[PDB]
Each structure stands twice: as C-alpha cells, then as structure tokens.
Amino acid sequence: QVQLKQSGPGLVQPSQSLSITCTVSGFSLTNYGVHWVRQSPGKGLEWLGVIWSGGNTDYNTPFTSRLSINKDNSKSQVFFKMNSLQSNDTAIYYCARALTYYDYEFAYWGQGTLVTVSAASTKGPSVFPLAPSGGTAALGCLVKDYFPEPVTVSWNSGALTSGVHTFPAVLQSSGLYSLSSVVTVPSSSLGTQTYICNVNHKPSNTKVDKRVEPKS
Amino acid sequence: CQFDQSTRRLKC
Amino acid sequence: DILLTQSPVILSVSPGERVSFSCRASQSIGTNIHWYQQRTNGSPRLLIKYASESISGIPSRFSGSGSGTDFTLSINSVESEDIADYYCQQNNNWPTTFGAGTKLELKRTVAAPSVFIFPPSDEQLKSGTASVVCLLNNFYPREAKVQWKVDNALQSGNSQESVTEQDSKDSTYSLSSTLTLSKADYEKHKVYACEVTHQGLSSPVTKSFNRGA
C-alpha cells in the first residue's frame, strides 16, 4: 500500500515560513522522488519542486529563492519549507509520487494540507445542537466561530454516513468561520439511538463530541 | 471558475 | 511555460451520456499529457497517462486520445459518481503545468427540497448570540430562495447560505441558511419562519417555530 501522509493544517503569519512533513509508506525514498504541488484560488494547480531519490532537488523557477526540500530516508520523511509567505500563498499543499522513479505522472498523492496565511489568531469552535422536533427527522451540529479552516465532522465515530451533509464553511462578518453538519434519521429512532457529531479542529487541537437529541 | 480550498472544488 | 486551455469551463451532461473534455496546448507536446479527477474534499486522482494509457484501478469508462496540441478525455457513459473537476497536465516541457480545470455537472429530474427549521440552543443563547438555521435537503436544481421572517418582518442582511456540492449518489444539492441575531433581538420576537421558494414547489413552503414553545 503506497501512502503519503502529511502533517496537519494551520495558520502561517504573513512573511513567516511554512513547514510540512510528508511521511511515506509502501516504498522507499531511496527509490522514488517526492514532488510537491499546491492548489490555490489564484493559480490553481502549480508544481513547486521535487527531491529525487539521490537527494538532488529541483524547484520551479518562481520558488527557487524561497523553497527548500529535504528528507530522511531512514525515517521515510520528506520535509518541505517555504519562506516569506504572503496572503496569496494560502493554498492546499500536497506531496506526490510518480509511477516511475524519474517521471511526473502523479499516481499517489498526500491528503493535502490547507495552509492559511493571515495575521489573525487560531481559535477553536463552539459546537451547538441543531435539535429535531415526514416520519424523517433532521438533526445537526452548528460548528461556530473558528479560525482557520478546516474542521472535520463525522457522526457516530464514522459509523453514520448515510444522509449526512456537512456544508462548506462560511466566513462570517467577524472574520471567523462557521458551518453546520446535518443528518436525516427516522423520527422513531430518536429515543433509543444516540446521535453524536464528532468535531475536530486540528489547528487549535479542539475536539468535541456533541450528542444531539430532541429538546424537552 | 475559481478553485475553492474549503471544498477542493472549482467554484463558478 | 506551456499554457493548457481546457474547455468547456463547465460541462453539463445527462447521466448515461458519453462526455468529452478538451485540453489544448499552446504548442505541440506529443502525447505527454496526463489527466486527473478531483472529487469534493479529495486529492487529485490520476485517470489517464500519456494521452491514452490506462491506470490500474480506474474504471474502464475513462479513456483518452489525442497527439500534438489537441487532447480529449472521454467518459463513455457518465455516472453520478463522476461529479468532479477534471484537470490535464503536460510534461513535454519543464516545468510541468496544469490546465485550469473543467467542472462536470450532472442533470437530473427536478426535486423539491425538504425543509427543516432549528431554533437556537439555550447553550448558545448564554453567549449573547442566537443562530436560527433553515435546512433545505436533497433538491434540484441548485437555485432556491430562502427568506426569513421574524414576527412577519422580512430579514435582510443578517443571514448567510451554504450549498453543498452535487451529491455523488443522487445528484442533488442541500442548502443551509443561518439567521444570526443578538440574544436581545431574539428575545423580543415570537414567530420565526423560513420561507422557501423553488422550481419544484408549486407554492412556497414555510417552516416556523414560536420562541418559548
């Protein structure tokens, strides 16, 4: 199983540096290069650079002065660092591996790291119930006032997926995000089945498990 | 369209 | 660098149809083009390499063709699970570059929303703010109008909407509208209503609650 797992998302202050770790498994860094790609609103998909199996690096020309990539073969870790970030460096950053040691067809991707460049402060969410009261009931969790993105929401520790909708976050006029996650269930299940929304805001290490049930 | 990092989808 | 032009920007199609994506390079790149799919909240997924070569694990309905400057990604019978953005990539010339993407949208029959309203929790109220939420579930098309009325006064400027991407199983949308009020304003009024208009509704649907009931 070839896998690439990246470090978690978070905030970088303007003019400061971004560091991401890519831990690989199922192959050796002595046999394959690892590439870095980012995806931004302003420029879409953009290849940033590569560290080859032998340690050489190539960087895309606009980044040669502020990018450095290193690795530890023995730890299966690749280290990405980019200096002097500005607001428009906000993007999803990926590591990726090609099919062949020398090529650029990216068959394997990390899960991506959302990097937000902002002078603001990290803040964890409050989690409030959206409490129910045709035969189908809707319930949910309101995940309010957090920064930066993202938050993950699951229901019943991932066991409940059918009928779940987790909406895109909205930026409120306060500069903080909010989102809701909802699920529809049989109304006769509200007495005996427990419904828990599991909220994780990794930038602030805030985890909340919130039971949602009809109110008295 | 424009890429939206909250959904990883093009927003048009 | 090589510029890649993808067309159309939005590709709207009916399920079961053959669909074709265009990727055109600013100069000849031989067959050095690769294609990727990106689903909601996902990382890019390699579909086709070197214009036409298949990838292990990718459904057989995906294929590719072309050489020189004009390239085509094809899905021979599109499914709801194909809702995604599609990107081409060239690597005939350093540095490798990507196209801007084509968004694939799927047509389906009209479906009216199911509407649900949620009052603020007492937990939130002791923070000084009230969020009232209106849910429109599993509807098509995406266009819908949600109007808030508080004691029959139309609210303007204090709500925000969020819409999901198209669902990969049934091609519908859902929408959440959040009305934000100070606790003081919330406690001064009684009737809270969400009124929904949509192509699949012959007349508007109103869901409401009375504060303190």
Numbering used by the authors:
A (entry chain B): 1 to 133, 139 to 221
B (entry chain E): 1 to 12
C (entry chain A): 1 to 213
Task: Quote the study's own text.
In a second effort to create favorable hydrogen-bonding interactions, Leu5 was substituted with glutamine and, separately, glutamate. Based on the few available cetuximab structures at the time, we anticipated that the hydroxyl of Thr90 could be oriented to favor interactions with the carbonyl O atom of a glutamine or glutamic acid. In contrast, the uncharged glutamine variant has an off-rate that is only approximately nine times faster that of the original meditope.
Multiple strategies have been developed to modify monoclonal antibodies, including chemical conjugation and protein engineering. Recently, we identified a cyclic, 12-amino-acid peptide that binds in a cavity formed by all four IgG domains of the cetuximab Fab. Owing to the location of the binding site within the Fab, we have termed the peptide a meditope (medi-, middle, + -tope, place). Based on our observations, the peptide–Fab interaction does not affect antigen binding.
